[PDB]
Design a binder for these strands. Structure first.
Length: 1069
RNA sequence: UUAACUUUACGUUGUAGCUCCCUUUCUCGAAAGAGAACCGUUGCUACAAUAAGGCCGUCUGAAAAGAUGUGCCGCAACGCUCUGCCCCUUAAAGCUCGCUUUAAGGGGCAUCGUUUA
């Protein structure tokens, strides 16, 4: 029905979209529709953590406590099956009655006495409950706090063997209490941690001694079962399980994916790097000559690491040649690694360390033997499995050496079998695809609607959610308007970037915003009688001036600073012509006098300065750039000489990141586009998107409105190749002046007027777009939005009377669509558990350490008035350290006796807190703070409204809450809902709601429902900063609202309608 | 890089035995000060619970109890095969002065499906 191009602007939390109708030749002519869709990014917002991480953590904690409870239960049940049970020292649940508080003392006496069945069961249960640390490639090292825990473990094991201690218990008692005053570990310390081997030896010695003094129950079955309980734990993921949790090598499905610390895999990576290597010299780009490869090829084995500096040393590299891909910005760039055979050298040093290897000669194990060492050491996590796998094929001395030092862990995407047929070909200089093609010379049916985004190809949560929402928007646009001709994409550079990368980008952007204002101050004080404030071209002019030593790059005549902003005095030329390269990067922008750019035309410096003829002007200019404060990338670009005219501008026009490659392939293959034929999907390059936005008069106002996301989606949608051709020929006409009274030779036959500004998609493009996106004429933010079709259409027809295609049957105000969130699960209560004792008073008590405790906390100390000296001593020390309690209570704090002496040490005091509501946790002995409400049921009676809050713990227990919030009154005196009330709707977070009160009408997405007031917050759809607190209406009273209802909304911001719910939905199925 | 993955060791809450301070209070004292009761609560150690909640399997058992186990799931992402909810389109009848019913189709969201166990 319409020939339109769908432009998308994909962010990590948004998707802008616009449809632009095109004519037969693909020029843009009408803007049909647009929208913005916003969501929550697939990460923990403040920390950048994975959203699944809290899940994973809590699940593993659940399993740990579950397994321990099961194991202690089996311990009692085995005490029951044999011997000392009691069966009368049990109780209703099954726990031992009057069990004792002395186990450490009893275990230290267990060597000198037959303990009571009571004491015997006590210490057995104690051993099993706290069974020390296990090795889990045998005994080893890596991470700093795991390393600290093993520091403690090894220290205490050595202490038992060297010193006067029979078993861990006696060590604990004697030394720990003589020098510390406690046994078990504290806060984050791991000094008193024991290994499981020492405790198993303790169990066996206790059994020996207790057969020595008469403990009847020293059975085979009791011994063997107790020790099995103490030692058994489920296997870690072994080989075939790990091989299955990975992929299966696509090139050889019978075989698994290779281990990365193997000879063949490391050789594969090294050969790919070697064949990929390029050298950039003074504009040239060349691969490594065969001799260069030979020289480098065996070096990564010979030396520990092959550094780029050393690569430059071995290659006869002249001082101006540099390595492509490397970041050459600062000091030690060529200190980076080019290759490091980590497995080769790990094995070699492991042997060297102990005498199995010479060190003067390369390790002599076979490529296969190294492959087997690597695969086995990466597939198994214990001594015994590794020794079983490797004893068959390599000698025990070198093996035992390998078990002590080696810690390998990663996998690659291809099998050892497929690599062994491939890397002998890349050894002969052929690339990977070519190599695969020769061997496996082989290795897509389209529907109307795009299928789901495959998670296998998108190994990133943020990217996966962004692409899922983009797919939703695409399929909605298809439903409403049919199949698009082509889909043009612009995705933010922060899509696909680590959280730390994004925050670093943010800090760099702030730094640049400060540095440019410093540059403007310098420009001011340089040219003092300068009228204004200066543009960005002027500051760039001065920066290039400084960079080129105040010397024109094309003539050598000194640029005169005082005339720097004289009109026409100095130009900024594109070294390579923008018409043939579409390269607008600062690597291409030089500062020259006006007198010399008139002759240049559309010439590259190579051609213009006659680089082919080795002319004196050419060598002079080439030396003039190599002696400028330019970056090697800029100096390299300015003198390209031999680039791919078409390929270079293809890469400048397109965006080739993995997200964009995957989209351009997946969308094109799997969805129908009624588009001409070749690249039906186009991922615009961000640089040219910015350029086109600036020239087309659209440059946006930096995130004061969620609707700016639509803007670039329009831009990318008008970036069709026909428009590209128009712009190209325009820039070319500009290059060689041609703007006087001439003729446009080709097909326009038009005045090349002195002002022939940049080809636009259509006349008044900017204004129409601004009205369409913001509902306001641009430059006037201050205005009132035409928030209805009528107003919008009348505004478009008034301020764009010349253009009647700016009003049609699809022009509607932009409404940002927010992804709903109606999940009825989640965190049931907050994490810290507090005392439910003084809960009739609105109080709860929690133990607060002194290192956490600041004066606000200390005011609520339970014993503030009982122990006044303690209160005021704490207060005085903290006031000395100004509420930095880490500094305040580093040195131990003590209570004092009435004679003024040091007594018991204090580490944590009890503090009463506020507690009106909570969740009953820990078998009704703890109170927790409520979580976030997953639902709000709304009822009506007497033209007033009543909000029943529904939390997730109530959903778990299956209780549909009775009462509705009453401001002020706490929950016991809330309004009980019965059949006398009329239910209206359930509110989930981010549902669209309308509230008509006496004073105003409010329309937006439900955000929060305060439970002390019954009021609600709503996000304005576009989150405009002018409204509420950062786009949020706070404390909207709905108890006495005239109207209050819920709405339905599209993924495209359409179909806004009230929805009516028949019956109140339950909490459980 | 994804996202799954043995364990330990803490931390919190409840309760015990020992303890440091200390508010009220009784007693002994000419004082200085001592000594004891409830509670608060410092510190050590131990047991329990460690989301709120839901289950398995095996073996006795006649059920209807018991034994019992390297037991299992529960804060997420995605989806639309099953099901619930919302909404939309089209066609056909009628109660009445819209509403109801039938039939075919199309989407969204989930307490539904998968990852998973």
């Amino acid at each position: 029905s319409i020939n339109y191009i769908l432009g998308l602007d994909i962010g990590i939390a948004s998707v802008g979209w616009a449809m632009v109708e095109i004519d037969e030749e693909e020029n843009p002519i009408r803007l049909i529709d647009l929208g913005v869709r916003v969501f929550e990014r697939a990460e923990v917002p403040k920390t950048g953590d994975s959203l699944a991480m809290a899940r994973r953590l809590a699940r593993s904690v659940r399993r740990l406590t579950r397994r321990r409870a099961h194991r202690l239960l089996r311990t009692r049940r085995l005490l029951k099956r044999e011997g000392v049970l009691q069966a009368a020292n049990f109780d209703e649940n099954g726990l031992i009655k009057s069990l004792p508080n002395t186990p450490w003392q009893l275990r230290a006496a267990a060597l000198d006495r037959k303990l009571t069945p009571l004491e015997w069961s006590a210490v057995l249960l104690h051993l099993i409950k706290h069974r020390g640390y296990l090795s889990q490639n045998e005994g080893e090292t890596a991470d700093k706090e795991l390393g600290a825990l093993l520091k403690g473990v090894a220290g205490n094991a050595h202490a038992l063997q060297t010193g006067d201690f029979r078993t861990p218990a006696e060590l604990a008692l004697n030394k720990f209490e003589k020098e510390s005053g406690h046994i078990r570990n504290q806060r984050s310390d791991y000094s008193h941690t024991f290994s499981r081997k020492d405790l198993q030896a303790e169990l066996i010695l206790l059994f020996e001694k207790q057969k020595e003094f008469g403990n009847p129950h020293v059975s085979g079955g009791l011994k063997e079962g107790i020790e099995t309980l103490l030692m058994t734990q489920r296997p870690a993921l072994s080989g075939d399980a790990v091989q299955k949790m990975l992929g299966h090598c696509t090139f050889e499905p019978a075989e698994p994916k290779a281990a990365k610390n193997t000879y063949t895999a490391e050789r594969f990576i090294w050969l790919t790097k070697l064949n990929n290597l390029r050298i950039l010299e003074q504009g040239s780009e060349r691969p490594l000559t065969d001799t260069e490869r030979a020289t480098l090829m065996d070096e990564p084995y010979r030396k520990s690491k092959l550094t780029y500096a050393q690569a430059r040393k071995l290659l006869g590299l002249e001082d101006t040649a540099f390595f492509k891909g490397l970041r050459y910005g600062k000091d030690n760039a060529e200190a980076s690694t080019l290759m490091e055979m980590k497995a080769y050298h790990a094995i070699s040093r492991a042997l060297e360390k102990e005498g199995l290897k010479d060190k003067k000669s390369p390790l002599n194990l076979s490529p296969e033997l190294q492959d087997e060492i690597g695969t086995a050491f990466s597939l198994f996590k214990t001594d015994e499995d590794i020794t079983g796998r490797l004893k068959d094929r390599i000698q025990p001395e070198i093996l035992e050496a390998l078990l002590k030092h080696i810690s390998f862990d990663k996998f690659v995407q291809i099998s050892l079998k497929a690599l062994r047929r491939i890397v002998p070909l890349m050894e002969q200089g052929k690339r990977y695809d070519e190599a695969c093609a020769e061997i496996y010379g082989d290795h897509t049916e389209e529907k109307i609607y795009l299928p789901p985004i495959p998670a296998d190809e998108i190994r990133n949560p943020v990217v996966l959610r962004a692409l899922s929402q983009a797919r939703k928007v695409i399929n909605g646009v298809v439903r409403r308007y049919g199949s698009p001709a082509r889909i043009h994409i612009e995705t933010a550079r922060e899509v696909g970037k680590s959280f730390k990368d994004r925050k670093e980008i943010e800090k760099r952007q702030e730094e640049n915003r400060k540095d440019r204002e410093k540059a403007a101050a310098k420009f001011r004080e340089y040219f003092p009688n300068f009228v204004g404030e200066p543009k960005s071209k002027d500051i760039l002019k001065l920066r290039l001036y400084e960079q080129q030593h105040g010397k024109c790059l094309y003539s050598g005549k000194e640029i005169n600073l005082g005339r720097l902003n004289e009109k026409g005095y100095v130009e900024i030329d594109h070294a390579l012509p923008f018409s043939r390269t579409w390269d607008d990067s600062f690597n291409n922008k030089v500062l020259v006098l006006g007198s010399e750019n008139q002759n240049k035309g559309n010439q590259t410096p190579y051609e213009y300065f006659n680089g082919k003829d080795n002319s004196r002007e050419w060598q002079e200019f080439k030396a003039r750039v190599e002696t400028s404060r330019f970056p090697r990338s800029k100096k390299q670009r300015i003198l390209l000489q031999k680039f791919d005219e078409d390929g270079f501008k293809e890469r400048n026009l397109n965006d080739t990141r993995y997200v964009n490659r995957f989209l351009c392939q997946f969308v094109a293959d799997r969805m129908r586009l009624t588009g001409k034929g070749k690249k039906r999907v186009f991922a615009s390059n961000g640089q040219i998107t910015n350029l086109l936005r600036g020239f087309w008069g659209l440059r946006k106002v930096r995130a004061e409105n969620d609707r700016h996301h639509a803007l670039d989606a329009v831009v990318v949608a008008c970036s069709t190749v026909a428009m590209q051709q128009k712009i190209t020929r325009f820039v070319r006409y500009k290059e060689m002046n041609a703007f006087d009274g001439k003729t446009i030779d080709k097909e326009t036959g038009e005045v090349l007027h002195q002002k022939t500004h940049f080809p636009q998609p259509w006349e008044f493009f900017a204004q129409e777009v601004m009205i369409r996106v913001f509902g306001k004429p641009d430059g006037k933010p201050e205005f009132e939005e035409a928030d209805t079709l009528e107003k919008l259409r009348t505004l478009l027809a008034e301020k764009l009377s010349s253009r009647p295609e700016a009003v049609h049957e699809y022009v509607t105000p932009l409404f940002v669509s927010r992804a709903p969130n109606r999940k009825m699960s989640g965190q049931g209560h907050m994490e810290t558990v507090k005392s439910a004792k003084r809960l009739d008073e609105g109080v709860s008590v929690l133990r607060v350490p002194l290192t956490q405790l600041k004066l606000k906390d200390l005011e609520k100390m339970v014993n503030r008035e009982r122990e006044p000296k303690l209160y005021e001593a704490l207060k005085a020390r903290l006031e000395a350290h100004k509420d930095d309690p880490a500094k305040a209570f580093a040195e131990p704090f003590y209570k004092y006796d009435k004679a003024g002496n040091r007594t018991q040490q204090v580490k944590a005091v009890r503090v009463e807190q506020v507690q009106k509501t909570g969740v009953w946790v820990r078998n009704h002995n703890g109170i927790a703070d409520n979580a976030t409400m997953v639902r709000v049921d709304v009822f009506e009676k007497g033209d007033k409204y009543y909000l029943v809050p529904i939390y997730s713990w109530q959903v778990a227990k299956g209780i549909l809450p009775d009462r509705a919030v009453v401001q002020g009154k706490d929950e016991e005196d809330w309004q009980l809902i019965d059949d006398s009330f009329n239910f209206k709707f359930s509110l989930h977070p981010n549902d669209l709601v309308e509230v008509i009160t006496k004073k105003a009408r409010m329309f937006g997405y439900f955000a929060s429902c305060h439970r002390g007031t019954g009021n609600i917050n709503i996000r304005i759809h576009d989150l405009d900063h002018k409204i509420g607190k950062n786009g949020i209406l706070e404390g909207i009273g709905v108890k006495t609202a005239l109207s209050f209802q819920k709405y339905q909304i599209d993924e495209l911001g359409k179909e806004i309608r009230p929805c009516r719910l028949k019956k109140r939905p339950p909490v459980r199925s």
